Ligand binder design. Sequence first.
Ligand SMILES: Nc1nc2c(ncn2[C@@H]2O[C@H](COP(=O)(O)OP(=O)(O)OP(=O)(O)O)[C@@H](O)[C@H]2O)c(=O)[nH]1
Ligand SMILES: Nc1nc2c(ncn2[C@@H]2O[C@H](COP(=O)(O)OP(=O)(O)OP(=O)(O)O)[C@@H](O)[C@H]2O)c(=O)[nH]1
Ligand SMILES: Nc1nc2c(ncn2[C@@H]2O[C@H](COP(=O)(O)OP(=O)(O)OP(=O)(O)O)[C@@H](O)[C@H]2O)c(=O)[nH]1
Lengths: 438, 438, 37, 185, 427, 100, 178
Amino acid sequence: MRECISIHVGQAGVQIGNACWELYCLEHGIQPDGQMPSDKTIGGGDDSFNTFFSETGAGKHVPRAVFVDLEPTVVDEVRTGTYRQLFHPEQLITGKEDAANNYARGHYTIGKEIVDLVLDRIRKLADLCTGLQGFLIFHSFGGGTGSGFASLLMERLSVDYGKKSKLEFAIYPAPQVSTAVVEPYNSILTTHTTLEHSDCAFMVDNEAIYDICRRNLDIERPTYTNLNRLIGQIVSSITASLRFDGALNVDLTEFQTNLVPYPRIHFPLATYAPVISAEKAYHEQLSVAEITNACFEPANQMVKCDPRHGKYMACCMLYRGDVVPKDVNAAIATIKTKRTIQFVDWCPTGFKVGINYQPPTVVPGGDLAKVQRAVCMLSNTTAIAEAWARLDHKFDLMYAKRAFVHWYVGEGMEEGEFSEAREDLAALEKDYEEVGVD
Amino acid sequence: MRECISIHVGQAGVQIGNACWELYCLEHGIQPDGQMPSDKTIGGGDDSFNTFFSETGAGKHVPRAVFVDLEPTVVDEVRTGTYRQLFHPEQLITGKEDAANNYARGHYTIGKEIVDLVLDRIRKLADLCTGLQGFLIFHSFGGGTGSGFASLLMERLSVDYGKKSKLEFAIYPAPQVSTAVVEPYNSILTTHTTLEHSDCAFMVDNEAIYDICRRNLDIERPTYTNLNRLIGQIVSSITASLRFDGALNVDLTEFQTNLVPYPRIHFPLATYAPVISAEKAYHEQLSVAEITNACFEPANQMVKCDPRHGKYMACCMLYRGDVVPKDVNAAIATIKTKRTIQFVDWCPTGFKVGINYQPPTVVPGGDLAKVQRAVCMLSNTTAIAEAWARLDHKFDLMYAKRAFVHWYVGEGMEEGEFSEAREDLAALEKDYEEVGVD
Amino acid sequence: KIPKDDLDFRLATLYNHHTGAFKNKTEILLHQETIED
Amino acid sequence: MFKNTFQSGFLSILYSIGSKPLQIWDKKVRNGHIKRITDNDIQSLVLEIEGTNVSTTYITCPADPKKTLGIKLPFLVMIIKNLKKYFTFEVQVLDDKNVRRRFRASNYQSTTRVKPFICTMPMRLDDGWNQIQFNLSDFTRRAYGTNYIETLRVQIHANCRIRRVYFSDRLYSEDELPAEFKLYL
Amino acid sequence: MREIVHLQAGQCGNQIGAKFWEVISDEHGIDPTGTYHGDSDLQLERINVYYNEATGGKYVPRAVLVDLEPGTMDSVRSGPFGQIFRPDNFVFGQSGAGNNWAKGHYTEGAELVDSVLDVVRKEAESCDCLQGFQLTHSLGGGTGSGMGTLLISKIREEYPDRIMNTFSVVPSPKVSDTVVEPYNATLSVHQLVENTDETYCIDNEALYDICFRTLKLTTPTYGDLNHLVSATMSGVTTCLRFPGQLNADLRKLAVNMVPFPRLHFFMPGFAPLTSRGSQQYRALTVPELTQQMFDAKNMMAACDPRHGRYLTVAAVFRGRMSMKEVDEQMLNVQNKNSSYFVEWIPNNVKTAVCDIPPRGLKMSATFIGNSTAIQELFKRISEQFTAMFRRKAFLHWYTGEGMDEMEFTEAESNMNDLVSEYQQYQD
Amino acid sequence: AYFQEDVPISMEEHYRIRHVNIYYYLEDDSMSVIEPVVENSGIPQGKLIKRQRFTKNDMGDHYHWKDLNRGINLTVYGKTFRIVDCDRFTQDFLESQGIE
Amino acid sequence: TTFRKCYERGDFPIALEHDSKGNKIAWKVEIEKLDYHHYLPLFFDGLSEMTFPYEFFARRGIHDMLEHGGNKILPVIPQLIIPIKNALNLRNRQIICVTLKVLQHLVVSSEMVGEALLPYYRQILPILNIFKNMNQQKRENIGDLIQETLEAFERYGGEDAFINIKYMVPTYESCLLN
Ligand SMILES: Nc1nc2c(ncn2[C@@H]2O[C@H](COP(=O)(O)OP(=O)(O)OP(=O)(O)O)[C@@H](O)[C@H]2O)c(=O)[nH]1
Ligand SMILES: Nc1nc2c(ncn2[C@@H]2O[C@H](COP(=O)(O)OP(=O)(O)OP(=O)(O)O)[C@@H](O)[C@H]2O)c(=O)[nH]1
Ligand SMILES: Nc1nc2c(ncn2[C@@H]2O[C@H](COP(=O)(O)OP(=O)(O)OP(=O)(O)O)[C@@H](O)[C@H]2O)c(=O)[nH]1
């Protein structure tokens, strides 16, 4: 049927998936123990959880995800957390050695002896699944462990199962903020390995995530708890089509077929319009028109790109809540008549609407507002090559002076593969401008 | 009717024996006193115990077995144990002298004056029995006293009673672990004497039994309390057909006929699929599919052999618990469709199924899981000859330099009997590949 | 290619049950060129 | 094997007059020796085959176990000197139903055991250059009640001193036996 | 039931047996008076292996003390447990030994063997069925060697079917004090190798080093050395008296230890030896037990097997362990030095597990081993014989006693044959 | 429990009363009736109704342990049975459940 | 076919006389002293053997032994059915033409033949029942040979052998009382 497997690689990616699964247990009312009240929902495992959890005759919801990490610290503490009894012990794939931010070390030194084990997980989940549309990979480009280890496995999962979808989600590196100077190295390594295998990769940047908090949410001191909450909402919204229904139901296959124009570039941008403080939601009003403007307001994007220096190709709006076609179709018609919104002339229509009647619920101990009309805005533009152009002039500097190379050639690598990445990016950008050229 | 007598030679074979009646008394609810509660099951000795115990009008369940031992150490403290009141005093056949690992010492020196007493026991047990399908011989190939003493008695019980079954179960010598270099001597002496008289012999090896303990049971430091439990549940499973019923009932006579293809070689291998820890089975699910994979998973075997180095002839599965034929026959059909599994072309069908609805139960103070679907897998393959191949290159080294022979010839043997076994063994291996040769 | 666990374990293990003794899972399941060799 | 050759008359497969006769005699040397000593009463080279264990070192035909023997003849005469040690040998043949079988003859044997594939026989005899007589057809019909067809492989163990190996179809007399077959002391 | 009768001979053995017996009483918890204070049921049951019963709950030791000098036996009679030893068992002579082997082997022994045999047969009929006997003595000790060699020979024909254990201490390699001591040794060992099956090899110099290594308290007493060695002999005897899945019979053990008859000389091995701070600085784990169990420094018997290779090794473990740790530890040491074993035999390890720990500690072990390191022992004695037989030093006494050079010829010849025998089997 | 039957022909009497024993499996609400086995009886003893769920009414309902008090008459595929009394744990559990 | 190689190996002493457009065979060792039990059914596998010149040996010996080995086939009958039955399954006209000619001499070879064959009727009659009419220069008509076999077989069969054929062959008529 309609189910998928979530993948969480990197101790960067571990809390957010935990937060996502924490969110998921709320909307289904999942108790931390792993069972409902005396109300009847258990069976062979077929209900709203059958797409996400595995609540077999044993009665325990088993989430369909595997958390893989190379350092035991964070994976053991969550193994001592609140929902650890729900979690499968060796689905929480632990490690004892780090990659030291090195893409190749986690790709060669240790990933070999671990990928077989994590593969044993993914194959053993395969039998219990029936349709298994695809996967939900959570990672990071500047992965101290997320970057390298995922690259090997996605290669392995690409070759064995090339008949299904693979969804990639990674924090895009902060453009002007660098927590690591080797981060440009492993990041570009991830890209050229993923361009020829990844199906749909979506990026996000933390700086603008904070910029939202003290603009409309009015939070000058949020935390990951807040940061993981909002991205957990993002994936919750896109997965609501699997969870509930609506006026029309859409699937990632339709997303894939309609969003990506051409091979290689499959990197659109997400955006959620009704992000607002409770008080601003209180004595104001929410409706399709203003959230349509807000979602199309350039500063509401969590990526440091202004669309007016690029052009639009695809734009998807996923309306979760109480909406009607009348105002939706009329409002978008006005948006098409808008002049500043510069779509490429190649696409007459670039709009994919998803309607879900279920209202987006709040989380206890949360900070969000109570949203009746929501929309997650998935879109791709040519204003994105700015980020890669930022990386290369960064990257071209260090490589010429070849800093830290003694580390990578020290543990067994050479420069030719680093050489390949530069024209691959040069190929990617020139495709971006060529498709930009009408 | 449907009953048997169990035999236990060697102090190795007695503590493991003690476990199963410690196990067997639970499922019948037998109190350590020797009687039921006020509930009525006593009579002329005819109920679920009639096949196992002898609870006459006196009301005391008398188990139908004899414990023979040559050293008063291990037999006395168990005579002061917990169920010793259940045990008939002189079926705890105690001894005053040991065999010093010497096969012939326990076969010639002292066995003469003791077996006649044991013969008195078996005939006085034979008269009370009604059908007495056969015997359950528990012993050890590396028997300091198990080896030699069994060999003479199994000869004598063969000559007087050659009309009924004799079931043999012994710990196979550890292939690379040797607690005694005398072991290859007495073991091969047993095999050459037993090959032409034993009806069905079964071997197990403790190393992989220990390996299982920290593989899936996750116990790095078990004891025989666990080990005797694991072998005890194996014999309990095979005897459940005598105890209870199901879709169909199967018996040792059909086991013998359908397992052994040709004379001499009557040495199949057992395996229990649902071997897992309590908390693993707690939040996971058991079904025929995965347990079929587990039972046919090569490392789940407690005998050190690679099946791909051999070829399958017979496979007997005994499903105890709540199952249906539909998935089972579908599951086994998929196994027949498997290509790596290489049965010999001689046998089109090699599957012996026994279905019992009763779930396997847990033991007080136990370590096992909560099994609803269990199967005991009895199979024979040609990948076993390497074990005797291991022993002969082990044995041939010693014999040329004739180590320890002064001990044997010191108390009354010669060279010929030792010569016999090697071509008897050489016959065994040479028979193994020719049947393997299609 | 490969359908399921039992074949997954069996086709690529590099573990001789007769030779392998007191080994661990990682040591038990060991694949080939599937990973890199 | 060399069934294309004529089974008529004798079939002398081993004979020590040859400089290198070991072509089809595959030897498994194991804590023993392969030596060619001269004699006293027949004053000729013989095949000294000894070892600490009988099963360790043994000579066999064929040299390659994959290939058969292919011999019709139901009799055989072996030239051997009683070396006062543990000599044994075996023959694997084929009967009518095409079930293969071995005939293991051993000197030390205290009994005679029949297994549907292997028959164990005792050998007791005198000293010196004693001789060998066996009717293959006889043993098949006596033991398994079957009809003899073909030799497939013969294996000779250690503790022995061989001069010649040859088969025969009948109980050939010493008369037609040539001078080298008319062994002289 | 199967019992053992002990023999205490030689003036060192007089101090040996006293410490050995008192350890047993303290281990079993009997007061010095002899009235056992019932504290352990298991020790109550398996005490009849060595002790018989007297009235009033007094446990009579089944041992024999023999000597010539009244003062030593009076001293041990005045010891903390002299009351538990029997005046019946105090057999002796009216002569001073002269520390002379021949006098204790031909002259003084002649009129004393009759009594001691009439003695030992009395306890022999007192007990039911012996495994055999053990004798505490020394090979370089004059009275003990003279008596024992006589006794072991006579009791050979008496009961050639029993466990014929012998316990002797090797004199100090650097100084033998007694200078005719090698003469006594070759005469003893000639019959010993003919008349022993088991022989423990112990040397004092290693013990002095062991004090320098682990005891670290400068000035022991010889009783402390008695304390150490008596603990060692006790460990091998713990198998018989204690339950637990370990096969205790020395015949169960000796056949595993003796591939060929001429292997009679065996070396002890002991488990944790602890210094002043390490009683609370030690993590008592089987790995560090096995590590220290197999230490060339933990060796105490004669000298380092580093010179040669390992024929047979047998470790008995006492305490609360499991078969799995010793199993992997055995694989570790097997994989540690595989080549340092002999290719003659692999899997040369024999392990026993006594589940009943000692009194004072939980994890413990005793090791009995056979390596190719005895060649040094009888080669160091070899040149001494040749050097002094070169000029018949101290020989007129033995001729006066009635001995001559002829016996010495085969005595060394027997020893020389053993040199090649150990040499050829390994090299 | 107990049950009666009537002799149609024989020498001796007009009716036969026979004692039985009722067993309610608490785990799955299966039931079994085992008559005690008696010698010189002239009747085959053993198991009367094998382990199964006893259909209460015609829809397919089963006799559930809520509806079992003392002295209750119940029909099991023909023969109507009568409850006599209980055993130690039964009343304790049933009064723990609460049946007066 | 095992028999074909048996005298490719060469143990049967048979020769032949020489010719251009016909057939005739000779011998080396007298059959009457050689064997009628160990060599009889083996050579009948030669009837199942159809390969030149090995086929030439087949029919010659089978007929030739009949005129020279009359009252010795009696205790060998059960073994002789197998080479016949295999030839029946062979499903080829020329082979079947050969068989019936052979069986014609076989049935009338000596006494007791059909009387001894009484247990062994239902192993040959079925496949001949199905041949009845599936089809003088060279005796080619298979159907004619079929009725010829049945007629001589029933008159020599006895009393119920005829109705046994009638039970097997529903077309079957009699050659005795109609
Ligand atoms: N996805 C995610 N990223 C975070 C989080 N907190 C900080 N980050 C950023 O993500 C980066 C983590 O990357 P890595 O350090 O390579 O993570 P890793 O590969 O799992 O290995 P480690 O070095 O052990 O963390 C940091 O540089 C942060 O800038 C978080 O909670 N989730
Ligand atoms: N069956 C069994 N075997 C054990 C147990 N514990 C250890 N073993 C192994 O089983 C073997 C025991 O065999 P033997 O020593 O010949 O036993 P025996 O013939 O009765 O004579 P003994 O030497 O007195 O034990 C040992 O070598 C151990 O490796 C146990 O609890 N049960
Ligand atoms: N008791 C005791 N004996 C020691 C000690 N150190 C070395 N020994 C030796 O142990 C040996 C054995 O004693 P015995 O066998 O009784 O000696 P012996 O038969 O009386 O003849 P001698 O060797 O001259 O004493 C003696 O020869 C001593 O030299 C010690 O500290 N105490």
